[PDB]
Design brief:
Elements (H helix, E strand, L loop, with lengths): L4 E2 L14 H8 L9 E2 L9 H21 L6 H23 L6
Antiparallel strand pairs: 1-2
Length: 104
């Protein structure tokens, strides 16, 4: 995990899962969940889904690994409560820099 960048800070998103408990449970804890994502700039490899994919997986990684060694068994739900949020953020982080493509 060297050579990537980190775009600006957005506020945390709120993604529904199919129950309002999952909204709140995350929310009240959301201080721990990510609110920025690792990316690389608009040099060449720009995309939507495909650019999200790896930006997510990397930012998810440096949450999921640490938690395991910080005395936290995290589950598929705990991880997905990151993933939806990281996907949101990776969307926004691409889009943010992509706005400077119509003011160049």
């Amino acid at each position: 995990l060297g050579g990537y960048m980190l775009g600006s800070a957005m506020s945390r998103p709120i993604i529904h899962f199919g129950s309002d408990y999952e909204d709140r449970y995350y929310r009240e804890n959301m201080h721990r969940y990510p609110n920025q994502v690792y990316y690389r700039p608009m040099d060449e490899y720009s995309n939507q889904n495909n650019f999200v994919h790896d930006c997510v997986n990397i930012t998810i990684k440096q949450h999921t690994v640490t938690t395991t060694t910080k005395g936290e068994n995290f589950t598929e739900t705990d991880v997905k409560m990151m993933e939806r949020v990281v996907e949101q953020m990776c969307i926004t982080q691409y889009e943010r820099e992509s706005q400077a493509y119509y003011q160049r």
